[PDB]
CSV table of C-alpha atoms and ligand atoms in Angstrom, one decimal:
chain,number,residue,atom,x,y,z
A,29,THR,CA,0.0,0.2,0.0
A,30,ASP,CA,1.0,3.6,-0.6
A,31,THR,CA,2.3,5.2,2.8
A,32,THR,CA,4.5,8.0,1.0
A,33,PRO,CA,3.6,11.4,0.1
A,34,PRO,CA,4.4,13.2,-3.0
A,35,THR,CA,7.5,15.4,-3.6
A,36,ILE,CA,7.4,18.8,-4.9
A,37,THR,CA,10.0,20.8,-6.9
A,38,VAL,CA,9.5,24.7,-6.9
A,39,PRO,CA,11.4,27.0,-8.9
A,40,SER,CA,14.3,28.7,-7.3
A,41,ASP,CA,14.2,32.2,-8.4
A,42,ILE,CA,10.5,33.4,-9.1
A,43,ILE,CA,10.9,37.2,-9.7
A,44,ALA,CA,7.8,39.2,-10.7
A,45,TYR,CA,7.8,42.8,-11.8
A,46,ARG,CA,5.0,45.1,-10.4
A,47,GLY,CA,2.0,45.3,-12.8
A,48,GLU,CA,3.4,42.7,-15.2
A,49,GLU,CA,2.1,39.1,-15.5
A,50,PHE,CA,4.4,36.3,-14.3
A,51,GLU,CA,4.2,32.6,-14.5
A,52,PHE,CA,6.0,29.6,-13.1
A,53,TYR,CA,5.3,25.9,-12.6
A,54,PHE,CA,5.4,23.6,-9.7
A,55,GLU,CA,6.4,19.9,-10.5
A,56,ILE,CA,4.7,17.2,-8.2
A,57,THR,CA,5.8,13.6,-8.3
A,58,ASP,CA,4.3,10.6,-6.5
A,59,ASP,CA,5.5,7.1,-6.1
A,60,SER,CA,2.0,5.8,-7.3
A,61,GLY,CA,2.2,7.8,-10.4
A,62,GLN,CA,-0.9,9.8,-9.3
A,63,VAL,CA,-1.2,13.3,-7.3
A,64,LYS,CA,-4.7,14.2,-6.2
A,65,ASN,CA,-4.6,18.0,-5.3
A,66,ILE,CA,-2.4,20.6,-4.1
A,67,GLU,CA,-2.7,23.6,-1.7
A,68,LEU,CA,-0.9,26.9,-1.6
A,69,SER,CA,-0.9,28.6,2.0
A,70,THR,CA,1.0,30.9,4.4
A,71,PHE,CA,2.3,27.8,6.1
A,72,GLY,CA,-0.8,26.3,6.4
A,73,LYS,CA,-2.7,29.8,6.8
A,74,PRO,CA,-4.8,31.6,4.1
A,75,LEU,CA,-2.4,32.3,0.9
A,76,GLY,CA,-3.7,35.9,1.1
A,77,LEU,CA,-2.5,36.6,-2.7
A,78,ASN,CA,-5.8,36.9,-4.5
A,79,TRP,CA,-3.9,38.0,-7.6
A,80,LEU,CA,-2.3,34.6,-7.7
A,81,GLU,CA,-3.9,31.9,-9.8
A,82,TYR,CA,-3.0,28.4,-10.7
A,83,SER,CA,-4.5,25.5,-13.2
A,84,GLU,CA,-6.1,22.4,-11.9
A,85,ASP,CA,-5.6,20.9,-15.3
A,86,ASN,CA,-5.1,17.0,-14.9
A,87,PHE,CA,-5.6,16.7,-11.3
A,88,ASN,CA,-6.3,13.4,-9.6
A,89,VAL,CA,-5.9,11.5,-12.8
A,90,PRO,CA,-3.9,8.0,-13.0
A,91,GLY,CA,-0.3,8.7,-14.2
A,92,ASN,CA,-0.5,12.2,-14.0
A,93,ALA,CA,2.7,12.5,-11.9
A,94,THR,CA,5.4,10.1,-12.6
A,95,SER,CA,9.0,10.3,-12.4
A,96,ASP,CA,9.3,10.7,-16.0
A,97,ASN,CA,6.3,13.0,-16.5
A,98,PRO,CA,5.6,15.1,-13.3
A,99,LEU,CA,2.4,17.1,-12.8
A,100,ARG,CA,3.3,20.4,-13.9
A,101,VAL,CA,1.1,23.1,-12.2
A,102,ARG,CA,1.0,26.5,-13.9
A,103,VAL,CA,0.8,29.4,-11.9
A,104,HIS,CA,0.4,33.0,-12.7
A,105,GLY,CA,-0.4,36.1,-11.5
A,106,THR,CA,0.3,39.9,-11.5
A,107,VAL,CA,1.9,41.7,-8.3
A,108,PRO,CA,0.0,45.1,-7.9
A,109,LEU,CA,1.3,47.9,-9.9
A,110,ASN,CA,1.4,49.8,-6.3
A,111,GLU,CA,2.7,47.0,-4.4
A,112,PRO,CA,5.1,48.8,-1.8
A,113,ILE,CA,8.8,47.8,-2.1
A,114,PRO,CA,10.7,47.7,1.1
A,115,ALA,CA,13.7,49.6,1.5
A,116,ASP,CA,15.6,46.3,2.2
A,117,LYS,CA,15.2,44.2,-1.0
A,118,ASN,CA,15.3,40.6,0.9
A,119,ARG,CA,12.0,41.8,2.4
A,120,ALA,CA,10.4,42.5,-1.1
A,121,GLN,CA,9.2,39.1,-1.4
A,122,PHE,CA,6.3,36.7,-0.2
A,123,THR,CA,7.1,33.6,1.4
A,124,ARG,CA,4.5,30.9,0.9
A,125,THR,CA,4.1,27.0,1.1
A,126,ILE,CA,2.7,24.2,-0.9
A,127,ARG,CA,1.6,20.7,0.0
A,128,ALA,CA,0.4,17.8,-2.2
A,129,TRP,CA,-1.5,14.5,-1.6
A,130,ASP,CA,-2.0,11.4,-3.5
A,131,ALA,CA,-4.8,9.1,-3.9
A,132,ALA,CA,-4.2,7.4,-0.7
A,133,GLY,CA,-4.3,10.7,1.2
A,134,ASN,CA,-0.7,10.9,2.1
A,135,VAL,CA,0.1,14.5,2.6
A,136,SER,CA,3.3,16.1,2.1
A,137,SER,CA,5.0,18.7,4.5
A,138,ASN,CA,4.6,22.2,3.9
A,139,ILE,CA,7.2,23.0,1.0
A,140,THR,CA,8.5,26.7,0.8
A,141,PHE,CA,8.6,28.9,-2.2
A,142,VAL,CA,9.2,32.6,-2.5
A,143,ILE,CA,7.9,35.1,-4.8
A,144,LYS,CA,10.2,38.2,-5.4
A,145,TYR,CA,8.9,41.3,-6.4
A,146,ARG,CA,10.6,44.3,-7.9
A,147,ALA,CA,9.9,47.7,-9.4
A,148,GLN,CA,9.7,47.8,-13.3
A,149,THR,CA,12.8,49.6,-13.7
A,150,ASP,CA,14.6,46.6,-12.3
A,151,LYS,CA,13.5,44.5,-15.2
A,152,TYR,CA,14.0,47.7,-17.8
A,153,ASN,CA,17.5,48.7,-18.8
A,154,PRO,CA,16.8,51.0,-22.1
A,155,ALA,CA,19.0,50.4,-25.0
A,156,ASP,CA,21.1,53.2,-26.6
A,157,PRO,CA,19.1,55.5,-29.1
A,158,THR,CA,20.8,56.7,-32.2
A,159,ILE,CA,22.4,60.0,-31.4
A,160,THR,CA,20.6,63.4,-31.9
A,161,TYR,CA,22.4,66.4,-33.0
A,162,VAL,CA,21.5,69.6,-31.5
A,163,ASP,CA,22.3,73.1,-31.7
A,164,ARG,CA,22.8,74.0,-28.1
A,165,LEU,CA,23.6,71.0,-25.7
A,166,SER,CA,22.3,73.1,-22.6
A,167,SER,CA,19.0,74.3,-24.3
A,168,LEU,CA,17.4,71.8,-26.7
A,169,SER,CA,14.7,72.9,-29.0
A,170,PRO,CA,11.2,71.5,-28.9
A,171,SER,CA,12.2,69.8,-32.3
A,172,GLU,CA,15.3,68.3,-30.9
A,173,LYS,CA,13.4,67.0,-27.8
A,174,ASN,CA,11.0,65.2,-30.1
A,175,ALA,CA,13.8,63.7,-31.9
A,176,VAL,CA,15.4,62.4,-28.8
A,177,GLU,CA,12.2,60.8,-27.6
A,178,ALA,CA,11.4,59.3,-31.0
A,179,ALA,CA,15.0,57.9,-31.0
A,180,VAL,CA,14.7,56.4,-27.4
A,181,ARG,CA,11.3,55.0,-28.4
A,182,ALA,CA,12.7,53.2,-31.6
A,183,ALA,CA,15.5,51.7,-30.0
A,184,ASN,CA,13.3,50.3,-27.2
A,185,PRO,CA,10.3,48.4,-28.4
A,186,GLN,CA,10.6,46.1,-25.3
A,187,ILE,CA,9.8,49.0,-22.9
A,188,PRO,CA,6.1,49.4,-22.2
A,189,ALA,CA,4.2,51.5,-24.7
A,190,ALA,CA,2.8,53.0,-21.4
A,191,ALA,CA,6.1,54.1,-20.2
A,192,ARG,CA,6.6,57.9,-20.7
A,193,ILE,CA,9.8,59.2,-22.1
A,194,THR,CA,10.6,62.8,-21.2
A,195,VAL,CA,13.5,65.1,-22.2
A,196,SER,CA,14.9,67.8,-20.2
A,197,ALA,CA,16.7,71.1,-21.6
A,198,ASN,CA,20.1,69.4,-21.7
A,199,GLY,CA,18.9,66.1,-23.4
A,200,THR,CA,18.7,63.9,-20.3
A,201,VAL,CA,16.1,61.5,-20.7
A,202,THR,CA,13.7,60.2,-18.1
A,203,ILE,CA,11.6,56.9,-18.7
A,204,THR,CA,8.8,56.7,-16.1
A,205,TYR,CA,7.4,53.2,-16.1
A,206,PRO,CA,3.7,52.6,-15.3
A,207,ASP,CA,4.5,51.6,-11.8
A,208,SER,CA,6.2,55.2,-11.5
A,209,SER,CA,9.6,53.6,-11.2
A,210,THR,CA,12.2,55.5,-13.4
A,211,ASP,CA,15.3,55.0,-15.7
A,212,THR,CA,17.7,57.6,-16.6
A,213,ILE,CA,19.7,58.0,-19.9
A,214,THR,CA,22.6,60.5,-19.5
A,215,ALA,CA,22.7,63.2,-21.8
A,216,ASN,CA,26.2,62.2,-23.5
A,217,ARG,CA,24.3,58.9,-24.5
A,218,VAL,CA,21.5,60.9,-26.4
A,219,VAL,CA,22.6,64.3,-27.7
A,220,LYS,CA,25.9,65.8,-29.4
A,221,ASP,CA,26.6,69.2,-30.7
A,222,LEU,CA,25.7,69.8,-34.4
B,23,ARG,CA,8.2,107.4,-81.6
B,24,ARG,CA,10.6,108.5,-79.2
B,25,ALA,CA,14.4,108.1,-79.9
B,26,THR,CA,15.0,106.6,-76.5
B,27,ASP,CA,13.8,104.8,-73.5
B,28,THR,CA,13.8,107.1,-70.6
B,29,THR,CA,11.1,105.9,-68.3
B,30,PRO,CA,12.2,103.4,-65.5
B,31,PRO,CA,10.4,100.1,-64.7
B,32,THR,CA,7.1,100.1,-62.7
B,33,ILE,CA,7.1,97.6,-59.7
B,34,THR,CA,4.0,96.3,-58.0
B,35,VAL,CA,4.7,95.1,-54.4
B,36,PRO,CA,2.6,92.7,-52.1
B,37,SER,CA,0.6,94.7,-49.6
B,38,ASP,CA,0.2,92.1,-46.8
B,39,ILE,CA,3.6,90.2,-46.2
B,40,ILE,CA,3.2,88.0,-43.4
B,41,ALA,CA,5.9,85.3,-42.1
B,42,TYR,CA,5.8,83.0,-39.1
B,43,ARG,CA,9.2,82.2,-37.6
B,44,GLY,CA,10.9,78.9,-38.6
B,45,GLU,CA,8.3,78.8,-41.7
B,46,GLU,CA,9.2,78.9,-45.3
B,47,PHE,CA,7.3,82.1,-46.9
B,48,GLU,CA,7.2,83.5,-50.2
B,49,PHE,CA,5.8,86.5,-52.2
B,50,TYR,CA,6.0,88.2,-55.7
B,51,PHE,CA,7.0,91.3,-57.0
B,52,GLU,CA,5.4,92.2,-60.6
B,53,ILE,CA,7.7,94.5,-62.7
B,54,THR,CA,6.8,96.0,-66.1
B,55,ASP,CA,8.7,98.3,-68.2
B,56,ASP,CA,7.6,100.4,-71.4
B,57,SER,CA,10.5,98.5,-73.2
B,58,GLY,CA,9.0,95.1,-72.4
B,59,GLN,CA,12.4,94.2,-70.7
B,60,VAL,CA,13.7,94.5,-67.0
B,61,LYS,CA,17.4,93.9,-66.4
B,62,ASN,CA,17.5,93.3,-62.5
B,63,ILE,CA,16.3,94.4,-59.3
B,64,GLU,CA,17.9,95.4,-55.9
B,65,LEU,CA,16.6,94.8,-52.6
B,66,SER,CA,17.9,97.3,-49.9
B,67,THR,CA,17.3,99.1,-46.8
B,68,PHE,CA,16.7,102.5,-48.6
B,69,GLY,CA,19.8,102.1,-50.4
B,70,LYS,CA,21.6,100.5,-47.5
B,71,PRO,CA,22.7,96.8,-47.4
B,72,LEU,CA,19.3,94.6,-46.9
B,73,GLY,CA,20.8,93.1,-43.6
B,74,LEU,CA,18.3,90.0,-44.0
B,75,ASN,CA,20.5,86.9,-45.1
B,76,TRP,CA,17.4,84.6,-45.0
B,77,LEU,CA,15.9,86.7,-47.8
B,78,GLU,CA,16.4,85.1,-51.3
B,79,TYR,CA,14.9,85.7,-54.8
B,80,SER,CA,15.5,84.1,-58.2
B,81,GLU,CA,16.9,85.8,-60.9
B,82,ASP,CA,15.3,83.5,-63.6
B,83,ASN,CA,14.4,85.4,-66.7
B,84,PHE,CA,16.1,88.6,-65.8
B,85,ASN,CA,17.3,90.7,-68.5
B,86,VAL,CA,15.6,88.6,-71.2
B,87,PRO,CA,13.6,90.8,-74.1
B,88,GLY,CA,10.0,90.7,-73.4
B,89,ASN,CA,10.4,89.3,-69.8
B,90,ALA,CA,8.3,92.4,-68.4
B,91,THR,CA,5.2,93.6,-70.4
B,92,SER,CA,1.9,94.8,-69.1
B,93,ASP,CA,0.3,91.5,-70.5
B,94,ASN,CA,3.3,89.4,-69.2
B,95,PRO,CA,4.9,91.0,-66.2
B,96,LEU,CA,8.1,89.8,-64.6
B,97,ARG,CA,7.2,87.9,-61.6
B,98,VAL,CA,10.1,87.8,-59.0
B,99,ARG,CA,9.5,85.1,-56.3
B,100,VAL,CA,11.0,86.1,-53.1
B,101,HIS,CA,11.3,83.6,-50.4
B,102,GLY,CA,12.9,82.4,-47.2
B,103,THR,CA,12.5,81.5,-43.4
B,104,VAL,CA,12.4,84.1,-40.7
B,105,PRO,CA,14.8,82.8,-38.2
B,106,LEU,CA,13.3,80.6,-35.3
B,107,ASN,CA,14.3,82.8,-32.8
B,108,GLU,CA,14.2,86.2,-34.5
B,109,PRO,CA,13.4,88.6,-31.6
B,110,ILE,CA,9.7,89.7,-31.2
B,111,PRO,CA,9.6,93.0,-28.7
B,112,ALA,CA,6.8,93.5,-26.1
B,113,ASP,CA,4.7,95.2,-29.2
B,114,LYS,CA,4.3,92.4,-31.7
B,115,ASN,CA,3.8,94.9,-34.2
B,116,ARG,CA,7.2,96.2,-33.8
B,117,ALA,CA,8.3,92.7,-35.6
B,118,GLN,CA,8.6,93.8,-39.1
B,119,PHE,CA,11.3,94.9,-41.5
B,120,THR,CA,10.5,97.9,-44.1
B,121,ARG,CA,12.8,97.4,-47.0
B,122,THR,CA,12.9,98.9,-50.4
B,123,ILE,CA,13.1,97.5,-54.0
B,124,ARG,CA,14.1,99.2,-57.5
B,125,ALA,CA,14.4,97.8,-60.8
B,126,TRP,CA,16.5,98.5,-63.9
B,127,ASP,CA,15.4,98.3,-67.4
B,128,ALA,CA,17.8,97.6,-70.3
B,129,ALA,CA,18.4,101.2,-71.2
B,130,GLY,CA,20.1,102.3,-67.8
B,131,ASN,CA,16.8,103.7,-66.1
B,132,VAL,CA,16.5,102.7,-62.5
B,133,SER,CA,13.1,103.0,-60.4
B,134,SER,CA,13.1,105.1,-57.5
B,135,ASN,CA,13.0,103.0,-54.4
B,136,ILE,CA,9.5,101.8,-53.2
B,137,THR,CA,8.8,100.2,-49.8
B,138,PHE,CA,7.5,96.7,-48.7
B,139,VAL,CA,7.2,95.4,-45.2
B,140,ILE,CA,7.8,91.7,-44.0
B,141,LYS,CA,5.9,91.3,-41.0
B,142,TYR,CA,6.9,88.1,-38.7
B,143,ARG,CA,5.0,86.6,-35.9
B,144,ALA,CA,5.4,83.9,-33.4
B,145,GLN,CA,4.1,80.4,-34.8
B,146,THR,CA,1.5,80.2,-32.1
B,147,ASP,CA,-0.1,83.3,-33.8
B,148,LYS,CA,-0.7,80.9,-36.9
B,149,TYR,CA,-1.7,77.8,-35.1
B,150,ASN,CA,-5.2,77.6,-32.9
B,151,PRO,CA,-5.3,74.0,-31.2
B,152,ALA,CA,-8.3,72.2,-31.3
B,153,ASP,CA,-9.2,70.4,-27.9
B,154,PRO,CA,-8.7,66.8,-27.8
B,155,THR,CA,-11.0,64.0,-27.4
B,156,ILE,CA,-11.4,63.7,-23.5
B,157,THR,CA,-8.9,61.4,-21.8
B,158,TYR,CA,-10.4,59.3,-18.8
B,159,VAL,CA,-7.9,59.3,-15.8
B,160,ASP,CA,-8.2,57.6,-12.4
B,161,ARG,CA,-6.7,60.8,-10.7
B,162,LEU,CA,-7.3,64.2,-11.9
B,163,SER,CA,-4.5,65.6,-9.9
B,164,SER,CA,-2.0,62.7,-10.8
B,165,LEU,CA,-2.0,61.5,-14.2
B,166,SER,CA,-0.3,58.1,-14.9
B,167,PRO,CA,2.5,57.7,-17.6
B,168,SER,CA,0.0,55.9,-19.9
B,169,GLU,CA,-2.6,58.7,-19.3
B,170,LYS,CA,0.0,61.3,-20.1
B,171,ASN,CA,0.9,59.4,-23.3
B,172,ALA,CA,-2.7,59.3,-24.2
B,173,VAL,CA,-3.5,62.9,-23.6
B,174,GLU,CA,-0.5,63.8,-26.1
B,175,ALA,CA,-1.7,61.4,-28.7
B,176,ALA,CA,-5.4,62.9,-28.4
B,177,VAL,CA,-4.2,66.5,-28.7
B,178,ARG,CA,-1.7,65.4,-31.6
B,179,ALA,CA,-4.6,63.6,-33.5
B,180,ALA,CA,-7.0,66.6,-32.9
B,181,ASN,CA,-4.4,68.9,-34.5
B,182,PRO,CA,-2.9,67.5,-37.7
B,183,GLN,CA,-2.6,71.1,-38.9
B,184,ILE,CA,0.2,71.7,-36.2
B,185,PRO,CA,3.7,71.0,-37.2
B,186,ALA,CA,5.2,67.7,-36.0
B,187,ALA,CA,8.1,69.5,-34.7
B,188,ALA,CA,6.2,71.1,-32.2
B,189,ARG,CA,6.3,69.5,-28.5
B,190,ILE,CA,3.5,68.5,-26.5
B,191,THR,CA,3.8,68.1,-22.9
B,192,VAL,CA,1.3,67.1,-20.2
B,193,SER,CA,1.5,68.2,-16.5
B,194,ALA,CA,0.5,66.2,-13.5
B,195,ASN,CA,-3.1,67.5,-13.7
B,196,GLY,CA,-3.4,67.1,-17.5
B,197,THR,CA,-2.6,70.6,-18.5
B,198,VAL,CA,-1.3,70.7,-22.0
B,199,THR,CA,1.4,72.7,-23.5
B,200,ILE,CA,2.3,72.9,-27.1
B,201,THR,CA,5.5,74.4,-27.8
B,202,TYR,CA,5.8,75.2,-31.4
B,203,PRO,CA,9.5,75.0,-32.9
B,204,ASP,CA,10.2,78.6,-32.4
B,205,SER,CA,9.4,78.2,-28.6
B,206,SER,CA,6.1,80.0,-28.6
B,207,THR,CA,3.3,78.3,-26.9
B,208,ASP,CA,-0.3,77.3,-26.6
B,209,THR,CA,-2.0,75.9,-23.8
B,210,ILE,CA,-5.1,73.8,-23.2
B,211,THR,CA,-6.5,73.7,-19.8
B,212,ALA,CA,-6.8,70.7,-17.7
B,213,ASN,CA,-10.5,70.9,-17.6
B,214,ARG,CA,-10.7,70.6,-21.4
B,215,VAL,CA,-8.3,67.4,-21.8
B,216,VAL,CA,-9.0,65.3,-18.7
B,217,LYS,CA,-12.1,63.8,-16.9
B,218,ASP,CA,-12.1,61.6,-13.9
B,219,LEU,CA,-13.0,58.2,-15.1
B,220,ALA,CA,-15.1,56.9,-12.0
B,221,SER,CA,-17.4,59.8,-12.1
B,222,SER,CA,-18.0,59.7,-15.7
B,223,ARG,CA,-19.0,56.1,-15.9
C,13,LIG,C1,12.4,94.1,-35.2
C,13,LIG,C2,12.6,95.5,-35.4
C,13,LIG,O1,12.7,96.2,-34.6
C,13,LIG,N1,12.0,96.1,-36.6
C,13,LIG,C3,11.9,97.3,-36.8
C,13,LIG,C4,12.8,97.9,-38.1
C,13,LIG,C5,14.1,97.4,-37.9
C,13,LIG,O2,14.6,98.4,-36.8
C,13,LIG,C6,14.9,97.7,-39.1
C,13,LIG,O3,14.2,97.7,-40.2
C,13,LIG,C7,16.0,96.3,-39.4
C,13,LIG,O4,16.7,97.1,-39.8
C,13,LIG,O5,12.7,99.3,-38.2
C,13,LIG,C8,11.3,99.5,-38.7
C,13,LIG,O6,11.4,101.0,-38.8
C,13,LIG,C9,11.8,101.6,-40.0
C,13,LIG,C10,10.4,102.2,-40.7
C,13,LIG,O7,10.1,103.1,-39.7
C,13,LIG,C11,10.9,102.8,-42.0
C,13,LIG,C12,9.5,103.5,-42.6
C,13,LIG,O8,9.8,103.4,-44.0
C,13,LIG,O9,12.1,104.0,-41.9
C,13,LIG,C13,13.1,103.4,-41.4
C,13,LIG,O10,14.0,104.4,-41.2
C,13,LIG,C14,14.8,104.9,-42.5
C,13,LIG,C15,14.3,106.2,-42.9
C,13,LIG,O11,12.8,106.1,-43.2
C,13,LIG,C16,15.1,106.4,-44.3
C,13,LIG,O12,14.9,107.8,-44.3
C,13,LIG,C17,16.5,106.3,-44.1
C,13,LIG,O13,17.2,106.8,-45.0
C,13,LIG,O14,16.8,104.8,-43.6
C,13,LIG,C18,16.3,104.5,-42.4
C,13,LIG,C19,16.5,103.1,-42.0
C,13,LIG,O15,15.6,102.1,-42.4
C,13,LIG,C20,12.8,102.7,-39.9
C,13,LIG,O16,13.8,102.2,-39.3
C,13,LIG,C21,10.8,99.0,-39.8
C,13,LIG,O17,9.7,98.9,-40.1
C,13,LIG,O18,11.6,98.4,-40.6
C,13,LIG,C22,10.4,99.5,-37.5
C,13,LIG,C23,10.6,97.8,-36.9
C,13,LIG,O19,9.9,97.8,-35.6
C,14,LIG,CA1,2.3,8.0,-2.7
C,15,LIG,CA1,1.2,14.2,-17.9
C,16,LIG,CA1,17.7,43.9,-13.5
C,17,LIG,CA1,5.9,62.5,-26.1
C,18,LIG,CA1,11.9,101.7,-69.8
C,19,LIG,CA1,-2.1,80.0,-30.9
């Protein structure tokens, strides 16, 4: 008879960026070849992450969780755009647990997984724009600022369309991401004297 | 029939020359002579240097027989661009250059200088922005980056007549600034640009 609970592999680097959908997988195996169900919790208490969701496809089917072909549970969600980020980044995370059980009811211990979350600028790192030549490096014209923004945008299709690119009087570029975090492109990467 | 041409050419000048800074403009002088031939012209400041290096004209068809009759006058195309940052004083009407033109015929007769006036104005005198379609925002005092993008695109879409080189900026409360290439501006107040999304649903 089966007296051995399932075993769970969790991803080691779940990193989510505010306002951007993430996904990851748990992999569950049981010696019977069948996993019945799982539970996500805060060490047995309610999960408390209403923006997280996981698929229950293929739960409780014979052969759904063998060593060769484990049960792969897709988890996805979006950390809130305005989720506060602690000053200490080791605390900018949610530590949670998962347990699973087989058809005989053998339940695993609580296995820890950690969802780290970060500002969008930690994902983003703008690429170099083509240089814009300007008449005065300390006082860009409106047309030159338009050109600078266009060039930053053209070089960075991977940055959210919803990010706003602004240009200062000296050609310094600010990129403000939807979560209000920012990147800066120094003027020497952006403009040169005509 | 008189033995010689002693009559200088006759020049018609345009009456209302208006140029906007940074925008190419053009106007025409029309010149006739009793001989039918005009040799050349001079643009001056009452006989002094013109002192307007951005003013140009074509010498096409100059000094050609029949180039300047009453039926077919010599049409001289003058064109140029008033510099983007040409100073406009506190009195906008002082933003003008009074200059003079005369013309020679092929017999040595030169007309007496007559005046023409090039008025120049800021680009915002030419452009009147239409209000954008309203952008619906979550907080009227603190637009998001996507909402400012939307506002700018809405203003841009409602005003295709505005130059592409004009820069549209959007403040935290949705106040729009259109800064034309010559750095003159137009404003659209926030109440004509953004509305609260929740109250409008
Ligand atoms: C931007 C600006 O300040 N515009 C002025 C111009 C400029 O000062 C000048 O044209 C650029 O060189 O002067 C304006 O005044 C002139 C105007 O009153 C004309 C009238 O025909 O006369 C000029 O003085 C003449 C004078 O009439 C002649 O007798 C003399 O031989 O030459 C003088 C030199 O031009 C005035 O300067 C203008 O309209 O051009 C007024 C603008 O506000
Ligand atoms: Ca088992
Ligand atoms: Ca399977
Ligand atoms: Ca990074
Ligand atoms: Ca823009
Ligand atoms: Ca004559
Ligand atoms: Ca205007």
